[PDB]
């Protein structure tokens, strides 16, 4: 009910370089009255509970199906790649009032299901960008799961 997001993951082991390309979102929830949504994507690199790095896409105006093709790279040393989370949040930009979250997902070793599958496919295919769709989840539910270590 919140929408779907597609992004690719690439890890370059010898470089300790993690690249997330936000490709496209679709079926996004409508978050404006007298408009659609104005989605941008924020990416947080976290280590369980702690914020490490953040990046964000441009804003696409008045659409529930944004296309980005924007690449985001993070330094994650080989020894640390199974300790981090890449958190992807889609938000509706508003000039007036809160920028409300449409939904979010995270990938990493402590993710589950299709999110863990994507992460494992990345690690299993070093230097190759692996693209996968993800269902967006309620922000507060994903936030709770960020604390669950494996």
């Amino acid at each position: 009910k919140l929408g779907d997001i597609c992004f690719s993951l690439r890890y370059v082991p010898t470089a300790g370089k993690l690249t997330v390309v936000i490709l496209e979102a679709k079926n996004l929830k409508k978050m404006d009255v007298g408009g659609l949504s104005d989605p941008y994507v924020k990416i947080h690199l976290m280590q369980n509970g702690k914020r490490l790095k953040k990046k964000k896409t441009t804003i696409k105006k008045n659409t529930l199906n944004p296309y980005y093709n924007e690449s985001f790279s993070f330094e994650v040393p080989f020894e640390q790649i199974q300790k981090v989370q890449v958190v992807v949040t889609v938000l509706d930009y508003d000039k007036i009032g809160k920028n409300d979250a449409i939904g979010k997902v995270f990938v990493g070793y402590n993710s589950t299901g299709a999110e863990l599958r994507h992460w494992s496919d990345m690690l299993a295919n070093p230097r190759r960008p692996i693209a996968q769709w993800h269902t967006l989840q309620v922000e507060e539910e994903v936030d709770a799961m960020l604390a669950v270590k494996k």
């Binding site: 690249t19 924020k42 953040k54 990046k55 964000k56 896409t57 441009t58 985001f72």
Partner: peptide, 10 residues
Amino acid sequence: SDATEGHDED
């Protein structure tokens, strides 16, 4: 607080 970086440029 840090200004949020945008997409890769290279």
